[PDB]
């Protein structure tokens, strides 16, 4: 398929969107960074402007917490697939998330499904389409969908579906990163910068 | 999706109509970082109600108060996705929300508002008022600001008149007045409205 | 209504337009303006370049008759109401009167509507659609439609509106300003700056 | 009406176009000129490219013959009227024609329809649309029309419908100003630059 | 008549194309160069974008076998006349033949029409419509027609319509020039440079 | 055909696309490279962004395992023919391979078609409409097809379409190159710098 489901990979993140206004889907991302000689964010398809904003809110938080300054990196983003009549989430957390991973080159867990919106202070803001999605992800066989926690009440799940996925709510990006980044030294050191 | 209690900087419950008649509470966040030439950033279905509305109160963001816009980037979102949402234009809410973010004076969440702002800062009337309010009563918003010329337009089916305080306004500072957190920072904004 | 009808307002003018088939709107413009904290005409939406235009050519009748410089002011020009399929007039003058207003703070006759094209060397040129326009204007319910001279012979009012509106005919930018700058000292001091 | 059919006039030509599939009509031009500060060309409505193809091609000629550099002017052109589904001709000669006039401030016979395309080299070129353009024109009361002479064979016109218009051919531009521009000491000076 | 069927000029070539549904026609271009004083390409009408992308290609080659860089220069492209429902050919060679011609002012034979897409590598790819095309050609009194080497089988030249016209099929632009540029000392140096 | 389906040729490669809903096309790419005479991508239409992107990423890679740098060449990337409503994959390899071609001037198996998306560290990521695409490369007779490996299990190739074409599961641009490059001396000086 268009997504991986088990494993950690750098700078690759399983996001979620809505196709039609009925079913949902995994919107898999990849982000890659190389040096410049000041930088653009390179992304095509119909979701390009969501790439662009996403990085734009994430850049800030990069400098604001690590001093790393990505006007010096060209940022490369592809929606692994192609996505007609798909609607993303404004400033998709999953996009900001892959870039944090790439830039830091700390691997990301793919068993772990994701969607929500994000902001320039670092808050995870609520998004349309939660159930479709939780539900899409139940379908992809992803183990835990992480979601914005204001949507705790928008989740509507048949007792029995409650059961198949670990729905984990959150509301700052530093918690997304703690629930996705691979364990290790690099991670430990990164987390504490978000204090 | 919208918060109905509390205050947050840069963060306003506008009201709009979902196609036919059906008001939606339609929330925003605005933020501002300075620029390293100044832009407006925003996305989804309503990106251009966003850029017209900021670019259209630009004069007024500077020409009463503090900083020129073409010196910050203005990051706007609508919190959720809004297919078939007809929004207002020169949205008092997008303006309120930017002002709020710039001065970091927080905004009242229990109080929805709808209106069109103008470049001299009137609050011109808009349509859908009764629909929008109903959305607001339905959502448990406590008060709602509307334009003064839409006063006549409000036909609430008894029981409903009494579920919501309907506040009519004219000028953008009546709007801010009525939604900003009381404090030094406002006493002070308020008076720069001469 | 989304338009006023009694009042003398500053930065404002009821220019007329044509949407859809033969149809009429009244399209209200609002001017508003700032010594520039070079200058700029900041405007929006479909008829932004019309505005730019109407101001550029109105800039010039002020720089040379009135001794002035628009170069030093951020000219805000907006439109009023949402109209798909709408159509401007080259240099449309409901604008330039709206504007000549901003800068002289001259108050305006919100009972006079108007259409028409403004040349640089000052003249009320003619615009097509002169009949239907007089009518979104009779519903508009307005006591005067100022038109260009050359356009008189396109006025075909039916039985239900002949004698329904004061169609005032005008040729220089000044019989526009004459029949719609509210009375007093500041008009008189300008009217003699032109005449 | 939206054009003048007699007397002369700085910077107005009565050009010609077709409307949807077939009617001839008249495409009135005003072009006017003002001091800059390196300049631009101002046109709004459907026919804006034509006008600026029109002028940028009319300068090299302004120089090579008269040394005005249109570089230091700001040219302002509008079509007098409202023009939907009307197709101009490429670098419409009427339009380069209104500009020589304004810039040279020598007036123009409005009794003479005209049409064709202007090569940057100063060639008058052949154009689609004669017979109906000459009708729109025989309908209008315009006494003569200059056509590119290459379209001489493309003029069908009827027994009763000849007699009523002077079709005149041209190949170069120095011949349109010759054939349209008011006579006067100004005119003779300029005719002499084109050698 | 929109074209010349005989004789030679500079920046003027007779392409070939089709009218909407089925039909074929002669499509006179003309392309002039003045220094850019960066080089924009310029042209208006329905063919306007078949003009820029055709030109923006060609110069791989325009730079590459021969004379000048065209970012230094300005391109004015007109289709002589007006072109309601006509599909032109991608990277048109009659455009390329024209721009090359206009840059070295080396006149083109107009008794020869050509059609075909120029690769950027300067090969001629095949183009549809060919049979139709050769025929507008024949209708039109032109003497020889260059076509693409691969639209050969596609030449369904009937009874009537054989021997009336010479078909010169070709595979390179450099061939296109050979067959149509004016025998002269400049051309001999042009041809050796496409060695 | 406008389509090479056998041979070996420099800068020419066979892309696939799903035009519209399921409809597959074969969409051939032409690369051409010019010693920038800093340097810049040159393409046209709906897919210029893709080509520029596919060139971006390709570069990171050539700059690496080959050590030659392609900011000193201008880059001409054509697509062959007119189809409409299309959706090229992000970083499409059809392109990236065409380049390394234009650049290593190493001609290419024209029997193979491919679809894919290129990462910057060069991984071949999978794209969408993988089935419909095999089906148009088939229906165009290309003796083989390259495809993203992660897309192997979405190949809904039936019992009708089972034994018609070499389907190639591929994980990285070098295997892509191993498999379409022409057996000889620079290829091997290539593939060997790619270890």
Swiss-Prot record, chain B:
Record: active site: 89, 132
Domain Lon proteolytic: 6-182
Compartments where found: Cell membrane
Top-level taxon in the UniProt lineage: Archaea
Function: ATP-dependent serine protease that mediates the selective degradation of mutant and abnormal proteins as well as certain short-lived regulatory proteins. Degrades polypeptides processively.
Family according to the record: Belongs to the peptidase S16 family. Archaeal LonB subfamily.
Subunit structure: Homohexamer. Organized in a ring with a central cavity.
Protein name listed in UniProt: Archaeal Lon protease
Upper lineage: Archaea, Methanobacteriati, Methanobacteriota, Archaeoglobi, Archaeoglobales
Shown chain mapped onto the complete sequence: 418 to 614 of 621
